Design an enzyme around this catalytic site. Structure first.
Site, PDB file in Angstrom:
ATOM      1  N   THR A  77      59.376 -69.769  62.636  1.00 29.67           N
ATOM      2  CA  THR A  77      60.055 -69.139  63.763  1.00 29.67           C
ATOM      3  C   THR A  77      59.729 -67.661  63.936  1.00 29.67           C
ATOM      4  O   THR A  77      60.235 -67.015  64.852  1.00 29.67           O
ATOM      5  CB  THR A  77      61.588 -69.289  63.647  1.00 29.67           C
ATOM      6  OG1 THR A  77      62.186 -68.974  64.910  1.00 29.67           O
ATOM      7  CG2 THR A  77      62.146 -68.342  62.584  1.00 29.67           C
TER       8      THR A  77
ATOM      9  N   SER B 256      57.662 -75.529  58.541  1.00 30.93           N
ATOM     10  CA  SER B 256      57.146 -75.704  57.182  1.00 30.93           C
ATOM     11  C   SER B 256      57.620 -76.952  56.438  1.00 30.93           C
ATOM     12  O   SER B 256      56.943 -77.413  55.516  1.00 30.93           O
ATOM     13  CB  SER B 256      57.413 -74.450  56.330  1.00 30.93           C
ATOM     14  OG  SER B 256      58.764 -74.355  55.914  1.00 30.93           O
TER      15      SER B 256
ATOM     16  N   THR C 233      59.717 -70.305  56.288  1.00 30.16           N
ATOM     17  CA  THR C 233      60.265 -69.945  54.981  1.00 30.16           C
ATOM     18  C   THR C 233      60.546 -71.099  54.015  1.00 30.16           C
ATOM     19  O   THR C 233      60.387 -70.951  52.805  1.00 30.16           O
ATOM     20  CB  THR C 233      61.582 -69.133  55.134  1.00 30.16           C
ATOM     21  OG1 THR C 233      62.551 -69.917  55.838  1.00 30.16           O
ATOM     22  CG2 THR C 233      61.336 -67.843  55.897  1.00 30.16           C
ATOM     23  N   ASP C 234      60.945 -72.250  54.544  1.00 31.96           N
ATOM     24  CA  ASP C 234      61.306 -73.372  53.693  1.00 31.96           C
ATOM     25  C   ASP C 234      60.309 -73.830  52.628  1.00 31.96           C
ATOM     26  O   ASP C 234      60.720 -74.122  51.509  1.00 31.96           O
ATOM     27  CB  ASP C 234      61.768 -74.550  54.555  1.00 31.96           C
ATOM     28  CG  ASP C 234      63.067 -74.246  55.303  1.00 31.96           C
ATOM     29  OD1 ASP C 234      63.739 -73.239  54.966  1.00 31.96           O
ATOM     30  OD2 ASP C 234      63.420 -75.012  56.223  1.00 31.96           O
TER      31      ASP C 234
END
Ligand SMILES: N[C@@H](CCC(=O)O)C(=O)O
Ligand SMILES: N[C@@H](CCC(=O)O)C(=O)O
Ligand SMILES: N[C@@H](CCC(=O)O)C(=O)O
Ligand SMILES: N[C@@H](CCC(=O)O)C(=O)O
Lengths: 307, 307, 309, 306
Positions: free
Chosen positions: D12, D41, D74-75
């Protein structure tokens, strides 16, 4: 076979002979010999004694029959003594400081285990060239970053932003990092042939801080002043007036922080120099040593970004 | 829609009007009214201005057309101002301090979101009776435990051992704890009518700390001294001499810690009182307020274990 | 002097008779009138729901007595957070229930067990400890069963609650209380297992790159009634995990999305399937879901439990 | 100005739309964007990460490329970052950057994170430090960094290992250098490969089922990472499951669900141990290890050195 380790005692609630006879398992790790340097609570450690300690350690490390050194010390000011030797020891051989948060007579005392780990670290070949270290609670911290963060807990020593150099679990050493700063064998500071250090005091920062504390420091002959300021070395109007008086008298002012962690960035609009990531206690040590080599503010400021 | 007054005192977060119009989203959360109280960096906030701030907030919260108050303040001494109001505001209604670590003109400025979150907290009915709070970086901290732990990062405000009162994620508040201390409505500290407060200074503890600093303080009429000592309030022989002189002159000596966290326990062998888990900055605030009601060391010590 | 019962379930702290444990740390006898009882003797990695169920029932029985002021439970460190949270929700009394454990064996140099035990008894016998929920005492800290978790595989300071902190600490033989949790527990909990003999089956599946759909099918084939998902980030799911979750829901299984990260809130998201675990980690989430299924199968009710307990 | 390429994969945090959004980066270096992919991700797969690594090796071999910045969600950035940390054969800086708040959110963190990533990637003092993840003024190593919180801005931390450095006031302050093998000194090379060995992760908890091990074995996995209780402890049901896997030639790796720390060796228990690698990092190293050998002793050494 086994490496030769000297255990140099200075005080603290941890310990020298008795100490060694308390955990004989150390004899299985190396050939140890104890030496009593002093016997005082760390809150009473002084610059002149630390200076002598550094000199004695350099003497021992020069010997071919000495592989490493372990130093018992009180927890309260061990970060100050450790950083001093970190900048003044001229050898790649391991120098390990060890301490204890609970007295040797207490239930579940931490001293015995901390000592065993300290000896294992000092005798391992992997430990050379890493700078001065502080071993306690299964962790290995660098003198440059480690600090006492809690008044009374076993897990008090931490380096929040920098982490530990390594950890000791199941009698095995796990090295994780190598610090990216100058130290020991590559330091320009040398205290051999020195018997006294420049006077440096520390003043706190807070709402309503007094200008008079600066006057007292100046009149008593300080060569430098470390300011444990609010936030990133911010200064009130009273503090600015006090710093100006100091600058006119040739006193070097170093702005640090009372927060506990972080970088104090330069600012052309404020008086004095900045401490980088060094906390008040660490900053004072480096300033004293810097003043033994120069008085040029440009040179001193660079020491703070590299040491 | 809750009636919220936004009182501006300074800080890089900002007048109060353009502040409110720079982030119009708050108008959807409540009917806000802005008021300029002052406009200065927090390092220049003094005890007499804070005293005035406290009295003004007590006045505002007494009105039935005010549901909560949000105070913009600089980050450097916000923990000092916030704890003062935590002990002097006689209301159940929410009092929320808000600040920003990056200037309003900075890329990715944190002020806008921090302000929106503070208004949401001040307007929520479940926020009643929790004491004074500090809202920043999605967290809600108690004035009694929160402190600036890093000189320059966004996540600087933390209570390592005490945690946060709650957090704000996805426009929803998640309350986790209620502090187990006295505050606001159950505090004995009354400041109506006062124009000034007792003088209290803070002295740092370190290797080679000087006696002359205690002399200077006494010489200038301080009524109390907060000692940010080594470890659990340890004192050197020089520090002890300075303290005994202050006690003779009738000055109150409070032993705290420079470490950053933890409890300083009682010790009959050492002079002065102990700060419990209050750090130097918080300890000074409580000692001043205590000096407005008593000079009996037994009473003061109890205040430090309950507030 | 308070009357405290020490219930031994196992753990390296005590294998040896609960009596031998008390005689080994005689100082406890000056803090209270203690009585030991050997409930079981196994490593916590082998503790089972039917066993934890029995422990809860026995503790409710003990605390109902006028001659019992509190209980201390020795247990292994590995799954103590699971056993402690189970009792946190099912013990119907305001008297202190304190779990204690040790990271080093009793025969280790600088063993932590002795001090941990002395601190636990001091906490269980103090009048200020009533009505605070089930606690876990170790390394001078007091933590709530709802927030505490083992954060490190091998250190003494492993038990922490990063975002929530400790309820209090014990220094210089004095207790310093700091917080009171703002959640429902014990006497104000709707969960009552007295009379139950079995528990609903609930398994936990991990989220990572390339996670397989077949693990969901396997769980469904073996009759699970609920699935806890230790997801990536805030309970995010891959195209394969979503297919697995949809098959589970089609077959009557309840899906709960949690996180593998270790801390924080998993927020509501109506775009994704399943319920969300609030700030409960996977281990804690499984305990609450199992208990919830003994009372209802209504998703709206279960979701509310996760925001209040 | 150094020449930096911004390779976008998703998250994002329109690679050129981002560049036009934060034009400050053009004062830090000559930037050029490339759209590699565009997905969340959680949907990143090994075959895609394999192609990403091959592309980065290709770019860093050029004279006109001083560094690379990769935008990612980020995940699972800790998984993609560690994979490249072990397969990129160059000393030039490779920096992953992400954002916890949407680009449309108030006080979005993405713009500043990107600016810091470009600064780090273009600094000569950043060479030879391994793959890095830059976010929230911090520089972390791919070997130690992990997402510790579900939704906060300060989520990326390495509790025991700390950060390599920090960025404050437009200046970089380096603190550590990791003491592990990586990039130019790694024996793993994925040039030519189109697929990787199957490795799954199973959780450890009270009442854990044996049938999950049977399921994995049935579907041809070559390795199993166990996110165990405490220091990789195993229940009797888990032991039964692990024994079946080993006799079928499956490699079992014991890690921990706790989040930090060392899983020490213990030969009274089945399988190997993960040193300080968490479950997600462990799966990555095990897959790559399996492209070289199946020997248990060798795989265990990789886990103590990488
Ligand atoms: N104040 C004492 C405490 C005991 C100890 O730390 O060993 C010291 O620093 O020596
Ligand atoms: N020293 C300034 C910093 C800016 C801010 O925190 O708002 C203050 O405390 O006001
Ligand atoms: N796996 C063992 C470790 C020892 C202990 O924690 O007591 C247990 O949890 O019982
Ligand atoms: N689940 C999304 C979250 C958004 C982001 O981190 O950019 C991802 O990991 O891509």
């Amino acid at each position: 076979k086994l490496p030769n380790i000297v255990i140099l005692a200075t005080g603290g609630t941890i310990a020298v002979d008795t100490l060694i006879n308390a955990v004989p398992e150390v004899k299985k790790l190396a050939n140890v010999k104890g030496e009593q340097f002093s016997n005082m609570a760390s809150e009473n450690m002084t610059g002149d004694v630390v200076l002598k300690l550094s000199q004695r350690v350099n003497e021992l490390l020069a010997r071919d029959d000495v592989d490493g050194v372990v130093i018992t010390h009180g927890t309260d000011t061990v970060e100050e003594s450790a950083y001093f030797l970190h900048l003044t020891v001229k050898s790649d051989k391991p120098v390990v400081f060890v301490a204890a948060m609970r007295p040797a007579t207490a239930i579940s005392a931490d001293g015995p285990m901390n000592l065993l780990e300290a000896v294992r670290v000092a005798g391992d070949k992997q430990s050379r060239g890493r700078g001065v270290m502080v071993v306690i609670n299964d962790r290995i911290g660098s003198a440059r970053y480690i600090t006492k963060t809690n008044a009374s807990t076993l897990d008090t020593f931490r380096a929040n932003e920098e982490g530990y150099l390594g950890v000791i679990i199941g009698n095995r050493i796990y090295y994780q990092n190598r610090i990216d700063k100058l130290h020991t064998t590559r330091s320009v500071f040398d205290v051999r042939g020195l018997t006294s250090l420049p006077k440096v005091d520390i003043l706190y920062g807070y709402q309503d801080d007094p200008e008079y504390l600066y006057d007292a420091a100046i009149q008593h002959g300080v060569k430098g002043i470390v300011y444990a300021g609010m936030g990133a070395g911010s200064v009130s109007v009273r503090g600015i007036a006090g710093m100006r008086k100091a600058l006119e008298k040739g006193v070097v002012v170093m702005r640090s922080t009372r927060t506990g962690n972080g970088i104090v960035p330069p600012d052309e609009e404020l008086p004095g120099l900045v401490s980088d990531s060094l906390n008040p206690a660490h900053a004072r040590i480096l300033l004293m040593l810097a003043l033994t080599r120069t008085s040029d503010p440009k040179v001193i400021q660079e020491y703070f970004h590299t040491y």
